[PDB]
């Protein structure tokens, strides 16, 4: 020198990112999905469907996952690590995508400001900052 409105979650926004669902080493992966998160726990997911009519239709979800989400990040292979003041939990989008939101803890404490380094040398190794300041 216009701006487009997509969904409008009613509660504030915390994390926006992307995943590679159906993951059946390189840094930049061609991400199949799109994810955002709320604070009070509203999660959003988008996918390309091209089902039931023979034309491309946007498949949206909207989950209401527990606890006030304080932070989240993405892991290689359609996984998302998010954090609530009780526990650090994880979500698997790899399976159209997922009807109900199933999530285990990782038995780590309330970590705010998570971040991941993908090793792919063993296993995946993330860096967290615990709410106690460690």
């Amino acid at each position: 020198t216009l701006v487009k409105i997509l969904h409008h979650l009613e509660e504030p926004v915390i994390f926006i990112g992307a995943l590679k669902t159906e993951p059946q080493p390189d840094e930049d992966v061609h991400c199949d999905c799109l994810v955002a998160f709320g604070h009070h726990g509203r999660m959003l997911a988008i996918k390309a469907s091209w089902d039931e009519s023979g034309k491309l239709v946007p498949e949206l979800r909207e989950y209401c996952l527990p606890g006030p989400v304080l932070c989240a990040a993405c892991g290689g292979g359609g996984r998302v690590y998010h954090s609530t003041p009780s526990d650090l939990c994880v979500v698997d989008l790899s399976r159209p995508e997922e009807g109900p939101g199933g999530l285990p803890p990782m038995l780590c404490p309330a970590s705010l400001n998570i971040c991941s380094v993908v090793s792919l040398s063993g296993g995946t190794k993330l860096l967290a900052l615990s709410a106690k300041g460690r």
Partner: peptide, 11 residues
């Protein structure tokens, strides 16, 4: 009180 096992949770 602290995490000596190195699991994340305090003991």
């Amino acid at each position: 009180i602290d995490d000596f096992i190195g699991s994340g949770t305090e003991q």
